[PDB]
């Protein structure tokens, strides 16, 4: 109890001469509170149930009618040395590892590469589940982006970002903004549920740090009443995620040309939104306008850093795109 009061130091989050008692809900206006973020877990559980139903009953028949392999992976040819290496040394050999395996086994590099690819396919999930998951992600991202556009087109701070801080933190919470924030947090918690326990044969890497940071930001911006500037980020970062899933679906459906077109469009949108618009719009309204309108407050030094971190991550992703798109040309 006391440690929670220590963490929520009113001289750290809120600006100068502003206390949490000023943000208490009353009959005049409604302000965001931390207790409103507890519904996110039940809504995430409901979203996970709906996702399971959609994958098992809706996406699977469509994939079957789309000529998607309903069986599992293939069977690698038997080999004692290769099996021992796969179980002990590694599972995804590189060029040097392939050369070493060819030298040790006195076999061609192509045969060893094919055997290891078959073993990886055995360890990897089937195409049907990935197609269903991609379809669910595409539908959810499309709906989220459409709702974000519809909500933001009428807001006053979309065109003038300085309105995000003019009356901060004394800004009432509307139903649409609360629904948007709760939906985003619920989707991220649903992703956490599907990542942590649905299948433990996964990777906890960049996309998990990214998820954790996104949930961190959405929570500590909602509790700090920084909800007018978080909607811009949420709508900006969900614009390109609706095309990668379509590209994956096209790739799985043996549609190479459609996959290439969707992937190049996704690359263009991703680069433009997260390298051209983000640093000149969101970092502009966060680093400079907030400083000159709200003044210096400690929590600022936190939030900006995290945003910069996100930018760095997306820069890394740009690398992983810029080469692949070169192959797509």
């Amino acid at each position, epitope marked *: 109890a006391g440690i929670l009061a220590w963490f929520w130091n009113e001289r750290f989050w809120l*600006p100068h*001469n502003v206390t949490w008692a*000023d943000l208490k809900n009353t009959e*005049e*206006a409604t302000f965001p509170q931390a207790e409103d973020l507890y519904l996110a877990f039940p809504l995430a559980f409901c979203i996970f149930m709906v996702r399971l139903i959609f994958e098992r009953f809706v996406a699977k028949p469509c994939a079957i009618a789309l000529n998607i392999q309903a069986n599992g992976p293939q069977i690698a040819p038997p080999n004692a040395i290769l099996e021992k290496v796969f179980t002990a040394i590694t599972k995804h050999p590189d060029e040097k590892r392939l050369e070493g395996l060819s030298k040790q086994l006195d076999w061609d590099v192509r045969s060893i590469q094919r055997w290891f690819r078959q073993r990886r396919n055995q360890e990897k999930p089937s195409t049907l589940t990935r197609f269903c998951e991609s379809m669910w992600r595409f539908s959810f991202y499309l709906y989220v982006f459409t709702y974000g556009v519809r909500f933001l087109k009428k807001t*006053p701070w979309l065109w003038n970002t300085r*309105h995000c801080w*003019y*009356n901060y933190p*004394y800004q*009432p919470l509307t139903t649409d903004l609360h629904y948007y924030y709760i939906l985003e947090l619920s989707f991220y918690w649903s992703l956490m549920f599907s990542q942590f326990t649905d299948i433990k044969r996964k990777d906890f890497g960049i996309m998990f740090l990214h998820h954790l940071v996104s949930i961190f930001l959405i929570t500590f911006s909602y509790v700090n009443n920084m909800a007018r500037v978080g909607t811009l980020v949420l709508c900006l970062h969900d614009s390109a995620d609706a095309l990668l899933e379509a590209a994956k679906m096209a790739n799985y459906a043996k549609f190479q040309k459609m996959c290439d077109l969707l992937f190049v469009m996704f690359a263009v949108v991703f680069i433009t939104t997260r390298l051209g618009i983000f640093p000149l719009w969101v970092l502009n309204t966060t680093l400079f306008e907030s400083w*000159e*309108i*709200v*003044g210096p407050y400690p929590s600022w030094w936190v939030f900006n850093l995290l945003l910069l971190l996100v930018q760095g991550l997306n820069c890394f992703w740009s690398y992983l795109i810029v080469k692949i798109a070169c192959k797509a040309v």
Partner: nanobody, 124 residues
């Protein structure tokens, strides 16, 4: 949700200087954006100046910008309006108001301000 009382009104010679004061009896004066309006003989009320709770951002009218300065003191729970190089057109009744917790910053309409006041006459 606050009570506003104005002072500093009176009659001064041409090209004079006046300092109108607007005081509130409450602890919530620091959480509202204050504003000053004028009402000349005839026509209707006109917007003069306004500012947010922190006082960092202030915005005036087109015809009064460069001569009027609006400021606030949250320690004393008061707002000040200083006039420089007065003109005969400035003779009017001045009213002190406040944004009603929902109107966006930059509003220049009568309906956006709830807590009005008696006002003071200013004659040049």
């Amino acid at each position: 949700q606050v009570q506003l009382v104005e002072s500093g009104g009176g009659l001064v010679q041409a090209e004079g200087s006046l300092r109108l004061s607007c005081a509130a009896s409450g602890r919530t004066f620091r959480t509202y954006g204050m504003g000053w309006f004028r009402q000349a003989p005839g026509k209707e009320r006109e917007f003069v100046a306004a500012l947010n709770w922190s006082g960092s951002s202030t915005y005036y009218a087109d015809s009064v910008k460069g001569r009027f300065t609006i400021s606030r003191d949250n320690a004393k729970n008061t707002a000040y309006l200083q006039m420089n190089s007065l003109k005969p057109e400035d003779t009017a009744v001045y009213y002190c108001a406040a944004l009603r917790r929902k109107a966006e910053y930059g509003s220049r309409s009568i309906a956006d301000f709830d807590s009005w006041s008696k006002g003071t006459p200013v004659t040049v």
